[PDB]
């Protein structure tokens, strides 16, 4: 149905789409919060966060791959934000707070970043 992979993808176009999307993530203020900014194991009281989560891919880092073009394609970006949802789903072992923060994100985020990948191409 024309989505994900289609155009040659330039970070300027990609972002045109992947920006409002990552934004839809951010608008979830807390729900996106364990992602937007580095989880901050020093803050959340986490010692081995970068041991548990191999790729927390903060919504700031993802937004960066966007500002710089470290994806060459939108789904690579979604892979990052889903890489994020992962640190949520890998650490919060499905039964924690940020787990709900993410699950909701994935819900909204993609609810926008899906037709976005399509919007994009
Ligand atoms: O900025 S806050 O809204 O105050 C806040 C509060 C708690 C948070 N917890 N983050 C976690 C991340 C991983 C984990 O396994 C457990 C917790 C993160 C942010």
UniProtKB/Swiss-Prot annotation:
Chain positions covered by the region annotation Interaction with ASF1A: 86-104
Domain Bromo residues, every copy: 9-116
Effect on the protein upon substituting residue 89 to A: Abolishes interaction with ASF1A
Modifications made to the protein after synthesis: Methylation of the KIX domain by CARM1 blocks association with CREB. This results in the blockade of CREB signaling, and in activation of apoptotic response. Sumoylation negatively regulates transcriptional activity via the recruitment of DAAX.
Subcellular localization, as worded in the UniProt entry: Cytoplasm; Nucleus
Superkingdom to which the source organism belongs: Eukaryota
Effect on the protein of changing residue 40 to R: Impairs binding to acetylated histones
Residue numbers spanned by region Interaction with histone: 48-94
Involvement in disorder: Chromosomal aberrations involving CREBBP may be a cause of acute myeloid leukemias. Translocation t(8;16)(p11;p13) with KAT6A; translocation t(11;16)(q23;p13.3) with KMT2A/MLL1; translocation t(10;16)(q22;p13) with KAT6B. KAT6A-CREBBP may induce leukemia by inhibiting RUNX1-mediated transcription. Rubinstein-Taybi syndrome 1: A disorder characterized by craniofacial abnormalities, postnatal growth deficiency, broad thumbs, broad big toes, intellectual disability and a propensity for development of malignancies.
Subunit description: Found in a complex containing NCOA2; NCOA3; IKKA; IKKB and IKBKG. Probably part of a complex with HIF1A and EP300. Interacts with GATA1; the interaction results in acetylation and enhancement of transcriptional activity of GATA1. Interacts with MAF and ZCCHC12. Interacts with DAXX; the interaction is dependent on CBP sumoylation and results in suppression of the transcriptional activity via recruitment of HDAC2 to DAXX. Interacts with phosphorylated CREB1. Interacts with CITED4 (C-terminal region). Interacts (via the TAZ-type 1 domain) with HIF1A.
Function: Acetylates histones, giving a specific tag for transcriptional activation. Mediates acetylation of histone H3 at 'Lys-18' and 'Lys-27' (H3K18ac and H3K27ac, respectively). Also acetylates non-histone proteins, like DDX21, FBL, IRF2, MAFG, NCOA3, POLR1E/PAF53 and FOXO1. Binds specifically to phosphorylated CREB and enhances its transcriptional activity toward cAMP-responsive genes. Acts as a coactivator of ALX1. Acts as a circadian transcriptional coactivator which enhances the activity of the circadian transcriptional activators: NPAS2-BMAL1 and CLOCK-BMAL1 heterodimers.
Free-text note regarding domains: The KIX domain mediates binding to HIV-1 Tat.
Name of this chain's protein: CREB-binding protein
Name of the encoding gene: CREBBP
């Amino acid at each position: 149905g024309s989505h994900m992979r289609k155009k040659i993808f330039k970070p300027e176009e990609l972002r045109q789409a992947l920006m409002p999307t990552l934004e839809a993530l951010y608008r979830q203020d807390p729900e996106s919060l364990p992602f937007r900014q580095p989880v901050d194991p020093q803050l959340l009281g986490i010692p081995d966060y970068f041991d548990i989560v191999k790729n927390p891919m903060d919504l700031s880092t993802i937004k960066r791959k966007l500002d710089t073009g470290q994806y060459q394609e939108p789904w690579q970006y979604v892979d990052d934000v889903w890489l994020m949802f992962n640190n949520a789903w890998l650490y919060n072992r499905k039964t924690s707070r940020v787990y709900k923060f993410c699950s909701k994100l994935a819900e909204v985020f993609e609810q926008e970043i899906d037709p976005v990948m399509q919007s994009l191409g």
